[PDB]
Amino acid sequence: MKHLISMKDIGKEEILEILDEARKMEELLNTKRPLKLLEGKILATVFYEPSTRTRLSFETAMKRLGGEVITMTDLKSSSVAKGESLIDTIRVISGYADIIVLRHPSEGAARLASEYSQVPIINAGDGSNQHPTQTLLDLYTIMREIGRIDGIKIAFVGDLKYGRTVHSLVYALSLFENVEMYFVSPKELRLPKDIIEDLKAKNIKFYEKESLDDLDDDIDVLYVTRIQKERFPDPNEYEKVKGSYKIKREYVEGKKFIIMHPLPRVDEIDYDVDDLPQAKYFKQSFYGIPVRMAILKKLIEDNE
Amino acid sequence: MKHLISMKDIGKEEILEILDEARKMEELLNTKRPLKLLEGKILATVFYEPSTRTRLSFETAMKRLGGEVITMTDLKSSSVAKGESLIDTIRVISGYADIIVLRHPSEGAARLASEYSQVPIINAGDGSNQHPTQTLLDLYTIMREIGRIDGIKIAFVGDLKYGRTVHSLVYALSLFENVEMYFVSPKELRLPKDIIEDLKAKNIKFYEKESLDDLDDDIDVLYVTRIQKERFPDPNEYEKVKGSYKIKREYVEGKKFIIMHPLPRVDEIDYDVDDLPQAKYFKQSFYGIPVRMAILKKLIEDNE
Amino acid sequence: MKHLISMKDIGKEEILEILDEARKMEELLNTKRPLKLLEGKILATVFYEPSTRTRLSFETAMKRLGGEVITMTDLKSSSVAKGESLIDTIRVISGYADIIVLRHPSEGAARLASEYSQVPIINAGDGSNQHPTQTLLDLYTIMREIGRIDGIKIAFVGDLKYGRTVHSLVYALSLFENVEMYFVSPKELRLPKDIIEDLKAKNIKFYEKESLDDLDDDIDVLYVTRIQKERFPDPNEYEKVKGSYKIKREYVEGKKFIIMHPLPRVDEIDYDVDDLPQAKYFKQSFYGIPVRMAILKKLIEDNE
Ligand SMILES: [K+]
């Protein structure tokens, strides 16, 4: 693997390889002894747009591997208004570092960068169209907590129309077997039809549901995403929507599923669900570190 | 010690333990050989409010111990306006790191955080009510330079009414023996009465003084704090105040005391005092590193 | 060498020493094995003004040497409006760190700092009058790519009147032998006369040229700098200027010279020159790391 630009670039087997590697990274972390796997290696964080979350996780992952990190987070005026084009910055930075995590608004930005970069490019959103690492950690969470990915019944709740990370996860799962999908959302925010077509073609068993109550307790994974306010300018109607799709304790009690949420969690899930056994989004967050560790390590070693 | 939230949580003995540990850290630094005490450990700097000073010192302390540091300084809009509540951020970050230094405006913020954190919380101001580490380094300075803390005559000059760090130091000293306190300030900015009550109860010998000249040369330590402009909107009157309480060379010459100042120094002390023997605030600054080292180390090791 | 404040402070021999040291650093980098030369040492980046470029390179250099880095980039209001004077910050930071890279707008800022600093000061622009490290890496590039510095024919294109880095390089080269200089620029932006005097005095063979076509193919090095818009408010005339001095592929083909550019490259050089053999500015960028490594190492070791 030369770069990690989009989930579209890797198959089931290669995904499972990355997951195995992540399980190993997790054990290493459990060791509490200093790891030197990437000692002497430098990760360059290159963000034209902000993402404290993305930066922290990758920075943690790299440092857990004994590696170093240089950071470049503002380029909305630090070089985009300073003149330097993307391809110039990439070239300068691939000369400094050993690997780059890039978050750039322009479409195909990460792909172009990989073309001019002498080091591996990791795409952390362009500007948030394809986020492979988020999708990999989601899959990792499922494997860890459920045992394996094939044969799961997963339900997605929230804005399925603009949920980029849902989109990415949905596609990735279509590469697996016997996966039943449930798409719960406001009628206004249903999964993009083109995707629906992809699922139908791949002959995936799926359902579009209007309500959370339309779900039986056969679902193995509840993956909840955000429903932003920009979708309902009227505070009154927005109350309605939030109320209908907010995950609450009473609805969770005695359920089989685990609950996943890419974070941050704002309104989607009540605070008194956090302490329920099925709540796993914070554990999910942690899993993000071992899989980013595997990703970092793999890209370094695959290319030298 | 699980966390370090407030000086109110530790007694004389435990303070002295921390100080001994700091003396050891200082020797280690004097060695100029790479220290690995916290190799493989990650410190997370979590500030909703800015504090370049706080961040640098802790970051230096952690790195001197061979440890790593991840930084999160803006949360006034990076997650407070991004939606994520404090308790969520703490949970995500305690999953990434091994220890956290937190500076959050809300009262009892650090305490709440420690409740949701799986790792030790260090309170670097909430929003600047209790700063244990500053108070510990102040005490360390006194022990190092004076020999011991008991039996000192210390005078505080400046705004004693809003001097949070004076407040914290004053309380901590009340735990020691034979400590005589002198409180020099504008009548408008005298030490809060409730504190005065605490001192009277603890039967501490203390004096409220109007002028610097009311001090004899029996004082062992001169601890000076800031008198902000917000206290005297009239530039004319503010001239008067500054002039009356500014420490000047001629007043310092031949004095027994050392001069402590938490920094930054703006108007409180003339520049031509810096080079006088009794000037110790810059040495005080350095001492901040060894005691933060001890603090970091202790909290890691006490909890694993 | 106690500090590195200005090129005016070091002679040919000492420059060559630093260059040799840089060649060694470059080999070490080529090794791809973790270097520990500055393990346990802390570099403090102190910028009152912004310079993502400067910071990254030095930070990379220090980390390549196994060292650590603390960063302080905003002081336009973080301590300049927070009260603390430069000399105070320097003293606090020289207590924390082992070496400082300083970028401060005020003239003679770096020099003053070195006076109050207990650790070596590296001047990264004050506010951009003397940048020794840029000038050292430029010289390094020439030695590496040309073989040696003496006897080269170098042409400078762009704004020669406000090109601080050209000024610095020109002076440094005057310390070498048989160096022929060609100064290509708009008549409005010719090399400052006082410098011309220095060259005449040192009896350097040089020419002031109006056009790129006035250059023969005997030039060994083409060093191009920026011509900002502030020099030609009329977009119309600015078109003219840019067009006349922009380096283009057809002009470069079959040329003997290498092309150097301190970066960032905005308008000065066409993108389809990048891939021509004579294009070396990105390699030049990389060379910046080994020479900053040598600089960092030398200053640490010369002072302990
Ligand atoms: K490090």
From Swiss-Prot, chains A, B, C:
Pathway: Pyrimidine metabolism; UMP biosynthesis via de novo pathway; (S)-dihydroorotate from bicarbonate: step 2/3
InterPro entries, alphabetized: Asp/Orn_carbamoyltranf_P-bd, Asp/Orn_carbamoylTrfase, Asp/Orn_carbamoylTrfase_sf, Asp_carbamoyltransf, Asp_carbamoyltransf_Asp/Orn-bd
Gene Ontology CC annotations of this record: cytoplasm
EC number: 2.1.3.2
Annotated binding of carbamoyl phosphate, by residue: R53, T54, R103, H131, Q134, L263, P264
Pfam families named in the record: OTCace, OTCace_N
Top-level lineage group: Archaea
Record keywords: Pyrimidine biosynthesis, Transferase
Residues annotated for L-aspartate binding in this entry: K82, R164, R226
Stored HAMAP family: Asp_carb_tr (MF_00001)
NCBIfam families the UniProt entry points to: asp_carb_tr, PRK00856.1
Oligomer and partners: Heterododecamer (2C3:3R2) of six catalytic PyrB chains organized as two trimers (C3), and six regulatory PyrI chains organized as three dimers (R2).
Protein name, UniProt field: Aspartate carbamoyltransferase catalytic subunit
Species of the source: Methanocaldococcus jannaschii (strain ATCC 43067 / DSM 2661 / JAL-1 / JCM 10045 / NBRC 100440) (Methanococcus jannaschii)
